[PDB]
Amino acid sequence: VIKAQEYRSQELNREAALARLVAMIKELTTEKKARRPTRPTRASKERRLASKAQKSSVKAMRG
RNA sequence: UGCCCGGUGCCGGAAGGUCAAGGGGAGGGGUGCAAGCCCCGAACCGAAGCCCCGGUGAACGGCGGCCGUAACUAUAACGGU
Ligand SMILES: [Mg+2]
Ligand SMILES: [Mg+2]
Ligand SMILES: [Mg+2]
Ligand SMILES: [Mg+2]
Ligand SMILES: [Mg+2]
Ligand SMILES: [Mg+2]
Ligand SMILES: [Mg+2]
Ligand SMILES: [Mg+2]
Ligand SMILES: [Mg+2]
Ligand SMILES: [Mg+2]
Ligand SMILES: [Mg+2]
Ligand SMILES: [Mg+2]
Ligand SMILES: [Mg+2]
Ligand SMILES: [Mg+2]
Ligand SMILES: [Mg+2]
Ligand SMILES: [Mg+2]
Ligand SMILES: [Mg+2]
Ligand SMILES: [Mg+2]
Ligand SMILES: [Mg+2]
Ligand SMILES: [Mg+2]
Ligand SMILES: [Mg+2]
Ligand SMILES: [Mg+2]
Ligand SMILES: [Mg+2]
Numbered sequence: 001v002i003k004a005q006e007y008r009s010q011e012l013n014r015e016a017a018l019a020r021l022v023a024m025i026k027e028l029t030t031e032k033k034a035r036r037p038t039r040p041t042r043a044s045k046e047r048r049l050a051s052k053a054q055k056s057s058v059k060a061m062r063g
Numbered sequence: 064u065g066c067c068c069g070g071u072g073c074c075g076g077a078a079g080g081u082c083a084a085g086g087g088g089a090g091g092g093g094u095g096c097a098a099g100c101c102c103c104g105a106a107c108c109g110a111a112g113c114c115c116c117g118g119u120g121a122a123c124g125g126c127g128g129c130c131g132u133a134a135c136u137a138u139a140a141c142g143g144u
Contacts, residue, residue, distance in 0.1 A: 038134045 002024075004017030 033136050035135055040134090 002017055002020050004013040004020065007013050007016070
């Protein structure tokens with residue numbers, strides 16, 4: 001239910017009463033998009049850098 | 064109680080430009096036999112105002128546009144002009 005109320009002349013009011021329909025239909029019609037997710041790139045270098053130094057100095061003791 | 068003094072206003076500026084009456088008369092003219100009488104008149108000097116230089120917003124006022132860009136969507140902290 002749409003009401004186009006502001007012009008003196010009706011056929012302008014219809015021009016606007018209509019397009020409030022059509023452009024409203026488009027908004028509720030087209031919805032977001034593809035795609036997700038991205039996956040991690042440098043976990044090969046980065047985290048096996050941290051498993052490098054971790055294993056080495058781990059052969060120590062104590063605390 | 065923020066930013067903008069280009070514009071308008073007001074305030075300041077003993078320089079410069081313009082600028083009226085008036086001063087000044089180079090030079091020209093009417094007339095008379097002539098002394099002369101009469102009229103134009105350049106340079107130049109000659110206010111305020113305006114120009115020009117600045118100040119000023121609790122003075123009048125004014126406080127943008129397009130385009131791109133992030134863990135794919137969105138959006139754009141970031142950029143470009
Ligand atoms: Mg996504
Ligand atoms: Mg250790
Ligand atoms: Mg202990
Ligand atoms: Mg203010
Ligand atoms: Mg600001
Ligand atoms: Mg600024
Ligand atoms: Mg101003
Ligand atoms: Mg001003
Ligand atoms: Mg000024
Ligand atoms: Mg200035
Ligand atoms: Mg002025
Ligand atoms: Mg003044
Ligand atoms: Mg001087
Ligand atoms: Mg002067
Ligand atoms: Mg004179
Ligand atoms: Mg005289
Ligand atoms: Mg003569
Ligand atoms: Mg004669
Ligand atoms: Mg004179
Ligand atoms: Mg003078
Ligand atoms: Mg003056
Ligand atoms: Mg203005
Ligand atoms: Mg994206």
